[PDB]
């Protein structure tokens, strides 16, 4: 829940989080973004 409610005005997303959780894990769990 804490992660779900973050925004640019309060938090910054590290590049490694973006990489992992938007490419690697989603592809490994058989869920693909639009």
């Amino acid at each position: 829940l804490n992660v779900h409610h973050r925004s640019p005005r309060t938090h910054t997303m590290p590049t490694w989080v973006r990489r992992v959780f938007l490419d690697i894990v989603p592809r490994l769990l058989l869920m693909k973004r639009p």
Binding site: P8, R9, T10, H11, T12
Partner: peptide
């Protein structure tokens, strides 16, 4: 704080 804007 980001404070981007």
């Amino acid at each position: 704080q980001p404070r981007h804007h």
